[PDB]
């Protein structure tokens, strides 16, 4: 299995994790499992326990989720038994429970010089649960929490607007994976007044930062400037292929990306799916994808999602051909 | 009288501490950009303490006369507005970043801060443009107070009024909206007495012109600017490896 471990700077208090990618289902969240190891010394008068933080460092780490469980005085998973058997008797398990309605791990893109929702799992030994402990006698293992594409495809999007002519738009499908081109139908039924000389088709995602008040930020990740012109009292139709990628979006600011583990670069932020029956205050970041066409003005909005499917084996969470 | 001396004595430490956006060591952040903008503004203001001191304290007049007075006041006047204008925009910053921190895809580039500073400087020049067609020539009292103006105009009320809005009506409202406690006292005691004084000569000379009872709030304005110049500088792991399982 080759679980992931993060040894502390001092020769003690290591933590074992079977994975660093916890999926977020619509209903429940996969619990965090692992083993923290403590030597017989340094512990005879102390007690070991763990703590995870839902940091919101935007510099100012506005913590959101804090949970503490004591590993040194519930059922245990199969991987939990294997670690206990292999490591030895002097190993005390730790587990975590994540409730729903929490934001996923998304990090905004900075320019020429992170900020976003990140989760850190730290283990330290004390009694007062509030004593100031140095980072040397602790571990700092970063975990990621993301969502993946659902099995059931969604309905074909379709918009409508007749304000000033009459135009309609549609997409091939709702489920889009990262890097896949987007096909849009821009069939217009203009009747009179003006002959529109351009068709602006742009893809934008919503960076709904809901830290305190609200946010509806707009970023045109992909766009095009086709110079086709409609005619007065005539019909028109056209297709297009826009692909949202990161090669031309390096200079942009405020762009939302996927979860981060180091200074390595990632793809665009996956769309976040909330609960229809329960939409309370998130205090995080919500990312939703929208495709629009503009007649030059009038425009329409067509929903769509852009996020990865279920990985076959496991994500390394790092660009594979490094250095 | 001593208010200007105290202003200079408290300001020169601030001018020194400005030191190339705080020591030329910290990154060129937009916050540092506005800090450098206000440092330039109040340094340009501080460059002319001797002129204003000689204006009211040292022999009640300047030695150079019409050559100095106008120019000095002119420059001071313009950047005075710039200074309070700077306050507004930094107060405008103090809201945007702090009311609900979202400043990521908005005014988060050094270019947009430099353009903003240039815009404020252009606005200061534009508002001082009307003041360019002003200032005085002579003084027929053997004391060269640089008075008696020139061929110019019933229109002196509107200039004071617009000075009031650009000085107190908009800046104080913006500051009150920004502060909201936790969602400024020095500025309230700085700008209001000057505008209150201005209203004071306006209302009195509307019908019963001022006289031997005197109206000399110029040192009061100097003390308010001293308080402002004292306040503004003052207020402003290891690595992840792996193992083996059965």
């Amino acid at each position, epitope marked *: 299995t080759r679980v992931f*471990k993060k*040894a*502390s700077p*001092n*020769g*003690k*208090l*290591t933590v074992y994790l079977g994975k660093r990618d916890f999926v977020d289902h619509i209903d429940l969240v996969d619990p965090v499992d692992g083993v923290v*190891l*403590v*030597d*017989p*010394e*340094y512990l005879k008068e102390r007690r070991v326990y763990v703590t995870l933080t839902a940091a919101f460092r935007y510099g100012f780490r506005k913590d959101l989720f804090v949970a503490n469980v004591q590993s040194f005085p519930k059922p245990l998973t199969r991987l939990q038994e294997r670690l206990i058997k*292999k490591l*030895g008797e002097h190993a005390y398990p730790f587990t975590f429970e994540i409730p729903p309605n929490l934001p996923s791990s998304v990090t905004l893109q900075p320019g020429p010089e992170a900020i976003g929702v990140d989760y850190e799992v730290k283990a330290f030994v004390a009694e007062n649960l509030e004593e100031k402990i140095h980072k040397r006698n602790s571990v700092r293992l970063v975990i990621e929490k993301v969502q993946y594409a659902p099995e059931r495809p969604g309905p074909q999007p379709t918009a409508e607007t007749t304000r000033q002519l009459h135009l309609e738009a549609s997409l091939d499908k709702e489920i889009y994976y990262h890097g896949e081109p987007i096909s849009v139908n821009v069939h217009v039924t203009n009747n009179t007044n003006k002959t529109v000389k351009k068709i602006k088709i742009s893809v934008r995602q919503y960076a709904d930062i809901v830290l305190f008040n609200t946010a509806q930020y707009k970023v045109p990740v992909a766009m095009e400037e086709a110079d086709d012109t409609v005619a007065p009292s005539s019909t028109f139709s056209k297709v297009y292929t826009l692909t949202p990628f990161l090669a031309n979006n390096r200079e942009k600011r405020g762009l939302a990306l996927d979860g981060k583990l180091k200074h390595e670069d990632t793809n665009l932020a996956s769309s976040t799916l909330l609960r229809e029956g329960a939409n309370r205050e998130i205090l995080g970041i919500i990312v939703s994808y929208k495709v629009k066409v503009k007649l030059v003005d009038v425009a329409v909005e067509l929903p769509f999602t852009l996020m990865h499917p279920k990985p076959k084996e496991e994500p390394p969470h790092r660009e594979v051909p490094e250095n | 009288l001593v208010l200007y001396c105290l202003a200079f004595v408290l300001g020169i430490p601030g001018n020194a501490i400005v030191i190339w956006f705080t020591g030329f060591k910290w990154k060129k952040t937009v916050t540092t950009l506005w800090f450098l903008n206000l440092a330039i503004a109040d340094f340009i203001f501080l460059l002319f303490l001797p002129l204003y001191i000689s204006y009211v304290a040292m022999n009640f007049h300047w030695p150079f006369g019409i050559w100095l007075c106008k120019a000095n006041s002119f420059t001071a006047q313009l950047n005075m507005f710039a200074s309070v204008f700077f306050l507004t925009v930094i107060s405008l910053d103090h809201y945007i970043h702090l009311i609900h921190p979202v400043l990521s895809h908005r005014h988060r580039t050094l270019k947009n801060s430099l353009i903003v500073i240039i815009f404020i400087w252009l606005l200061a020049s534009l508002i001082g443009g009307p003041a360019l067609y002003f200032r005085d020539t002579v003084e027929f009292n053997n004391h060269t107070l640089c008075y008696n103006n020139f061929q110019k105009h019933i229109r002196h009320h509107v200039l004071t009024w617009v000075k009031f809005i650009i000085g107190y009506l908009f800046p104080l409202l913006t500051m009150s909206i920004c502060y909201l406690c936790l969602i400024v006292v020095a500025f309230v005691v700085c700008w209001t007495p000057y505008h209150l004084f201005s209203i004071w000569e306006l209302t009195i000379h509307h019908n019963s012109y001022s006289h031997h009872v005197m109206q000399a709030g110029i040192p009061l304005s100097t003390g308010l600017a001293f308080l402002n110049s004292c306040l503004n500088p003052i207020l402003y792991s*290891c690595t992840t*490896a792996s*193992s*083996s399982l*059965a």
Partner: nanobody
Amino acid sequence: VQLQESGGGLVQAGGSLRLSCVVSFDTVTMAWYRRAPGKHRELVASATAGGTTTYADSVKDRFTISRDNAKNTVYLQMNSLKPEDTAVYYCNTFVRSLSWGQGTQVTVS
């Protein structure tokens, strides 16, 4: 962190090898790990900072471990080597914080 060690060799039976552990201790506990051919990595001793030594199932009253801070090394000796103990030995912290360096293949006939 270099984890330089030596002492592997061929012994008939019952001959001590006197393995070493040269590393570039404070109050941590580190021990010796053995790896059977084709198997995983197990634990042998404890070798804590103070005097408290606990061994494995087939190591109690069989082997011995010692550590010295003068040379910044850890020693270990074998007594009455059975032919089933042919394995490569690794030296690391009981917490397993150091990288697994190259071991010495110790075989007995």
